[PDB]
A paper describes a structure:
These proteins bind to and sequester the apoptosis effectors, as well as the apoptosis sensitizers, BIM, BID, PUMA, NOXA, BAD, BMF, HRK and BIK5,6. An elongated hydrophobic groove is thus formed along the surface of BCL-2 and BCL-XL proteins, spanning approximately 20 Å to serve as the binding site for the amphipathic α-helical BH3 domains of their pro-apoptotic partners. Herein we present cyclic peptides (CPs) with nanomolar-level binding affinities to BCL-2 or BCL-XL, and further reveal the structural and functional mechanisms of how these CPs target two proteins in a fashion that is remarkably different from traditional small-molecule inhibitors.
This finding correlates with the higher binding affinity of cp2 to BCL-XL (0.73 ± 0.18 μM) than that of cp1. Meanwhile it is noteworthy that the side chain of cp2-E6 can also interact with BCL-2 R110 and BCL-XL R103 residues, respectively.
Author numbering:
A (entry chain B), D (entry chain B): 3 to 12
B (entry chain A), C (entry chain A): 2 to 141
The structure:
C-alpha cells in the first residue's frame, strides 16, 4: 500500500 | 585477523589501481548506488523525511526496541526499495543528530541497530526481490 | 551479514562526512600509512626490490608453500617494519604481474596467502613491537 | 642482521 512519497522511488 | 585481511585488500586494491587495474570488491557498486540514492532521497523528500526523523531522538538510555518500533512502521505492510533507502537515510540522520548533540559514542550503536534490522527484516526480502544487484540497476 | 554491516558503515561514514563530521574506522590511518610507505619503498629501493620480485612468478599451479619459502627468506633472521613494507610491496608486485599475464583470478589467492602469512608470522611480532599504531607514527 | 637496503626504513 502506498503510504509515503518515496513508495515509488526506484 | 579480519583487520589484517582488510589491510591486505586495501593495499593490493590501491597498488592495482595505481598500475591501471581496478580490483572491484563485491559490494563497491552497491555502496556507491546507496550513497547516491540516499542523496537523491534527501533532496526529493525533505518534508516527508523530516516527519520520519521527528519520530525518534536517541540518547545514551535508548534501547534497540524504540528504533525497531519506528522502523517497523516504515515497513509495517511490507518492504520496497524506496523504504530501504528511507531506512538508511533515517539512520544517517540519527547519527548526524547524535554528533550535533555531542553523543558521538551512539554512532556505532545506531550502526549495530541498522545491521540488526537489516539481518532480521530486510535481507530475507532482498534475497527474494533480486538482491542488492537489482537495487544497483534500478537506481541507474 | 558482514556484507550488510559494511554497507551500513559505508553509508553512515559517507553521510557523517557530508555533514562535516569524520567517523574514522579503526584501521583507516594504518591503511593510509601503508599505502604511503609502499610508494616510498618502491621509489627508494627499485633495484633491491626487483631482486625480491624476481624470486617468484605465480601461476594457477603455484602452492602457498612457494610464496611462504620466498617470504621466509625476507624474515629468516627476524621481522622489522621495513621488511613488512617489503612484504606488502612484494604481494602488490605479484598481483600486478598476475593481471599483466591475464591471471586476474590469482589476485584473491595472493591476498589470502598474504593474510595467512601475516596471521602466522607477522601479527605476533607486531603485538610485541607497538602494534600498527607504532608503524603509523614511525612512517610520519 | 642488516641484509637489505630497506632494513633501516621506518
Ligand atoms: C520502486 C521499485 O522498488 N520498483 C520495484 C518493483 N516494485 C516492486 O517490486 C514492489 C511493489 C510494491 C511493493 C509494496 N507494496 C505495498 C507496500 S510495499 C513492494 C515491491
Ligand atoms: C626502522 C624501524 O623499524 N625502527 C624501529 C626500531 N628498531 C627495531 O625495533 C628493530 C631493530 C632490529 C631488528 C632486527 N634485527 C635483525 C633482523 S630484524 C628488528 C627491529
Amino acid at each position: 500500500p502506498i503510504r509515503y512519497e518515496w513508495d515509488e522511488f526506484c | 585477523s579480519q583487520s589484517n585481511r582488510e589491510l591486505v585488500v586495501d593495499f593490493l586494491s590501491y597498488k592495482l589501481s595505481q598500475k591501471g587495474y581496478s580490483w572491484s570488491q563485491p559490494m563497491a557498486a552497491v555502496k556507491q548506488a546507496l550513497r547516491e540514492a540516499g542523496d537523491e532521497f534527501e533532496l526529493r523528500y525533505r518534508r516527508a523525511f523530516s516527519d520520519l526523523t521527528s519520530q525518534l531522538h536517541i540518547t545514551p538510555g535508548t534501547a534497540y526496541q524504540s528504533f525497531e518500533q519506528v522502523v517497523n512502521e516504515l515497513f509495517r505492510d511490507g518492504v520496497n526499495w524506496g523504504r530501504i533507502v528511507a531506512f538508511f537515510s533515517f539512520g544517517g540522520a540519527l547519527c548526524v543528530e547524535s554528533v550535533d548533540k555531542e553523543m558521538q559514542v551512539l554512532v556505532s550503536r545506531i550502526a549495530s541497530w541498522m545491521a540488526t534490522y537489516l539481518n532480521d527484516h530486510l535481507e530475507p526480502w532482498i534475497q527474494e526481490n533480486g538482491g542488492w544487484d537489482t537495487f544497483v540497476d534500478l537506481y541507474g
